[PDB]
Amino acid sequence: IVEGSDAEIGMSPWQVMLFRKSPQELLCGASLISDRWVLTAAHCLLYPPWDKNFTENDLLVRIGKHSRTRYERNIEKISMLEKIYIHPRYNWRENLDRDIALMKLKKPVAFSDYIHPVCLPDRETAASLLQAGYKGRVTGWGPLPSVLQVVNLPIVERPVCKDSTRIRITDNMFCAGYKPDEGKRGDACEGDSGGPFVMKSPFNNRWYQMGIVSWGEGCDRDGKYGFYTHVFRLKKWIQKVIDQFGE
């Protein structure tokens, strides 16, 4: 996160960090969607042109973290993974279409003040809230920044999104970020990849994950926007995996 502010404790209790187990290394953000399931971007786990193809035993997650440079005893939770599931039509060759992956925890986690799942959108919530100008929130760590950072970013008009890149964009992506001369700045960056873009519903006041940080051009550069996996468009596969596996 660039041009954000420190998160308050417990502000993003669905925030998950993905680590390579050996050797230790922060890879990506992710999100808690139940006691047993974590949502992330497929490119965090699989990207063949770079020979990237992590398996479950390569990885750990850390949940309930507020500070980056410390094991947070009594607050943080570390979990191993049973299985990774990548969208079968994830298009790593062209444009990262359907950049989505689920991770099944080895054991269910206990909820606390600091650990609590985010909601996934239904049709009505997606249609109401996914509109240009409407702001969501992304969380992650700062450049080179020991405390979790937060930034609020408005959803961008689709022709403006398309216009900003040579990449073929699909209905499975949206973009967010401030236009130049809006004054305000802010963006997701690199290590925030895989992390959640959340919105608070005005209908029931619950937080919904609408996006997954997917790709962009650099960091908080004028006229460029971060691109996000459209979680609702992919909910059928999410629900299928969670229903089929997860025993």
Binding site: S5, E8, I9, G10, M11, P13, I33, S34, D35, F111, S112, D113, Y114, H116, P117, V118, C119, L120, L129, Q131, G133, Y134, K135, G136, R137, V150, N152, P154, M199, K200, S201, P202, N205, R206, W207, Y208
Partner: peptide, 29 residues
Amino acid sequence: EADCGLRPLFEKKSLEDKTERELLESYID
């Protein structure tokens, strides 16, 4: 599941975070 998206330190205690109003203000314009 049934209790998703409600933060124990915020919605569950009738407390606002420092910037959530800005999000909701953006929908009601």
